[PDB]
Design a binder for this molecule. Structure first.
Ligand SMILES: CCCCc1nc(N)[se]c1CCC
Ligand SMILES: CCCCc1nc(N)[se]c1CCC
Lengths: 151, 157
């Protein structure tokens, strides 16, 4: 039951046994946007952004769960990763990437979830109505293309 | 084992904040290039000075701008701030994770705009940080080889 963890997630820290993978232009200097867990298909879709070559790219990768519990996915090689601790607000993970040249890299990561509550959303909506504001004149900043760049 | 909560206070509320929704009686204010299409980065609450400092980014003209605005509390509990005119805003709901607010903006042309906003706080508990560090050490990853993506996002470009 990890479906309820789907939604907007943000990268906090990423560590690597190979600094080149996470320095500027590194393939694993990933800013998470959204995570989607599917308990029936045993899969996880990652939506994130990476500045590769000189520009920003939005990437989508689907990970599949294995009998051992680990997940495997194809991104800058073959990756096999393990969630170490999850909860409503956090995800600490460890990933093993093996690139095109057989180079093995171990990465670690802390990601936090952006939890928007119903109780709070409702309050926002009542207030927006009280001020006679039209739902059309409301901007969603969580799923917006027009956003700033961290680098 | 043991469960513990950090002692709360406006001080504990400071930190990274993100904007979820912003509503406006005047759509020009929050459209692309509008001064109120603001992406929050951090907020600093000061109990003693009765102030709140805002850090956010707005795409003005053709490029992104980081902006800092200090607001001061009033006896009536509202806050005043100077940004793209004069602003008086009231926090209708605040807790460890959310902020719902109502702002009244009078621009340099006498025009009044009323805005509504929902913001969410990005909380990072120490238990999680402590668990991320232990894992990092276990794989023999040296701290110098760790990037803080949160601070990068709070200090963009
Ligand atoms: C362990 C959860 C995140 C794994 C992971 N770390 C990245 N950095 Se991008 C990614 C998915 C694609 C390989
Ligand atoms: C009500 C607190 C947030 C008010 C507020 N909303 C923005 N949008 Se920018 C900002 C600070 C400058 C007036």
């Amino acid at each position: 039951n990890l479906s309820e963890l789907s939604g907007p997630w943000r990268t906090v820290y990423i560590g690597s046994t190979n600094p080149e993978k996470i320095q500027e232009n590194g393939p694993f200097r990933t800013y998470f946007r959204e995570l989607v867990f599917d308990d029936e298909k045993g899969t996880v879709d990652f939506y994130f952004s990476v500045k590769r070559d000189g520009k920003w790219k939005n990437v989508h990768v689907k990970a599949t769960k294995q009998d051992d519990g680990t997940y495997v996915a194809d991104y800058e090689g073959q990756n096999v990763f393990k969630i170490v601790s999850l909860s409503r607000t956090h995800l600490v993970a460890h990933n093993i990437n093996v690139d095109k040249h057989g180079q093995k890299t171990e990465l670690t990561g802390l990601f936090v979830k952006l939890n928007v509550e119903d109780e709070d959303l409702e309050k926002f909506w009542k207030l927006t109505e009280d001020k006679g504001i039209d739902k059309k004149n409301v901007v969603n900043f969580l799923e917006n293309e027009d956003h700033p760049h961290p680098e």
